[PDB]
């Protein structure tokens, strides 16, 4: 579990979005595993605006933050998980590291702020849904 809180937006994995998220929907994209809802309170996070390929991510199934190198966001085949069938996911970054289903929502951060959230795992990789292209998160 986990979310990004930027301005008056809440960014969650689409597959973990709640009824209250869907009832207050700003934007969602199944191909990216992302959903954004509106918030009453302003959030503490800053979104990275950069092309870093190194950062640190939180792994709840280890209670640990790990430094990783990661691929640039791309259209990647993802094997079946507990929450999605095998499919192509877009805007996905991969790193070597541990990720189980409940790790989804852990933040990946670089020197510029939040890069994305954990979205995939298995076979010794962790996949992150990028948010650095969503420039509209930073206003309005
Ligand atoms: O519930 C609302 N939004 C989703 C949400 C927000 C915070 C959170 F911790 C979980 C889910 C919502 C939005 N608004 C209007 C701004 N009222 C309720
Ligand atoms: Zn960066």
Curated annotation (Swiss-Prot):
<feature type="binding site">
    <location>
        <position position="110"/>
    </location>
    <ligand>
        <name>Zn(2+) 1</name>
    </ligand>
</feature>
<feature type="active site" description="For protease 2A activity">
    <location>
        <position position="33"/>
    </location>
</feature>
<comment type="function">
    <text>Cysteine protease that cleaves viral polyprotein and specific host proteins. It is responsible for the autocatalytic cleavage between the P1 and P2 regions, which is the first cleavage occurring in the polyprotein. Also cleaves the host translation initiation factor EIF4G1, in order to shut down the capped cellular mRNA translation. Inhibits the host nucleus-cytoplasm protein and RNA trafficking by cleaving host members of the nuclear pores. Counteracts stress granule formation probably by antagonizing its assembly or promoting its dissassembly.</text>
</comment>
<feature type="binding site">
    <location>
        <position position="52"/>
    </location>
    <ligand>
        <name>Zn(2+) 1</name>
    </ligand>
</feature>
<feature type="active site" description="For protease 2A activity">
    <location>
        <position position="15"/>
    </location>
</feature>
<protein>
    <recommendedName>
        <fullName>Protease 2A</fullName>
    </recommendedName>
</protein>
<feature type="binding site">
    <location>
        <position position="112"/>
    </location>
    <ligand>
        <name>Zn(2+) 1</name>
    </ligand>
</feature>
<feature type="active site" description="For protease 2A activity">
    <location>
        <position position="104"/>
    </location>
</feature>
<feature type="binding site">
    <location>
        <position position="50"/>
    </location>
    <ligand>
        <name>Zn(2+) 1</name>
    </ligand>
</feature>
<comment type="subunit">
    <text>Homodimer.</text>
</comment>
